[PDB]
């Protein structure tokens, strides 16, 4: 990305929901994107927990990852900032009831450390059932929005 917000489109979503319905593990890897030209490179991982999972069953999981970037040697580490993850309600703009969370990066976590070769997010980001409570899936596609605010202050 150029600015600081990315929109990850996940199509063929219908087949994923049926896979998780018949007890088949599902994980999706998004493309890596930048928090800004001179910035950090991140990617997302989405999970659809099995119905037989002891904990967090039928929940959608979403984690953020740090990748190796072209400007790595030029930026301060670890990464600091505010990340907003949102599963977009595709209903009309004036009546959208999006589903999201906001988190501040934590330096002590190896998830925000400079890569060399573990992610951070929510195990229970959104229950699958919640998908039928709105028009989150339109045209067999789900939309995940990641908006990052980078803090370059060394304080």
UniProtKB/Swiss-Prot annotation:
GO terms for biological process: activation of protein kinase activity; antigen processing and presentation of exogenous peptide antigen via MHC class II; antiviral innate immune response; autophagosome assembly; bone resorption; canonical NF-kappaB signal transduction; CD40 signaling pathway; cellular response to cytokine stimulus. Expressed in heart, brain, placenta, lung, liver, skeletal muscle, kidney and pancreas. Residues 8-153 are annotated as: Interaction with TANK. GO terms for cellular component: CD40 receptor complex; cell cortex; cytoplasm; cytoplasmic side of plasma membrane; cytosol; endosome membrane; extrinsic component of cytoplasmic side of plasma membrane; glutamatergic synapse. Keywords: Coiled coil, Cytoplasm, DNA damage, Immunity, Isopeptide bond, Lipid droplet, Metal-binding, Nucleus, Osteogenesis, Repeat, Transferase, Ubl conjugation, Ubl conjugation pathway, Zinc, Zinc-finger. There is a cross-link at residue 106 (Glycyl lysine isopeptide (Lys-Gly) (interchain with G-Cter in SUMO)). GO terms for molecular function: histone deacetylase binding; identical protein binding; protein kinase B binding; protein-macromolecule adaptor activity; signaling adaptor activity; tumor necrosis factor receptor binding; ubiquitin conjugating enzyme binding; ubiquitin protein ligase activity. This ligand-induced cell stimulation leads to dimerization/oligomerization of TRAF6 molecules, followed by auto-ubiquitination which involves UBE2N and UBE2V1 and leads to TRAF6 activation. This 'Lys-63' site-specific poly-ubiquitination appears to be associated with the activation of signaling molecules. Endogenous autoubiquitination occurs only for the cytoplasmic form. The coiled coil domain mediates homo- and hetero-oligomerization. Homotrimer. Homooligomer. N-terminal region is dimeric while C-terminal region is trimeric; maybe providing a mode of oligomerization. Upon IL1B treatment, forms a complex with PELI1, IRAK1, IRAK4 and MYD88; this complex recruits MAP3K7/TAK1, TAB1 and TAB2 to mediate NF-kappa-B activation. Direct binding of SMAD6 to PELI1 prevents the complex formation and hence negatively regulates IL1R-TLR signaling and eventually NF-kappa-B-mediated gene expression. Binds to TNFRSF5/CD40 and TNFRSF11A/RANK. Belongs to the TNF receptor-associated factor family. A subfamily. E3 ubiquitin ligase that, together with UBE2N and UBE2V1, mediates the synthesis of 'Lys-63'-linked-polyubiquitin chains conjugated to proteins, such as ECSIT, IKBKG, IRAK1, AKT1 and AKT2. Also mediates ubiquitination of free/unanchored polyubiquitin chain that leads to MAP3K7 activation. Leads to the activation of NF-kappa-B and JUN. Seems to also play a role in dendritic cells (DCs) maturation and/or activation. Represses c-Myb-mediated transactivation, in B-lymphocytes. This is TNF receptor-associated factor 6. It comes from Homo sapiens (Human). The gene is TRAF6.
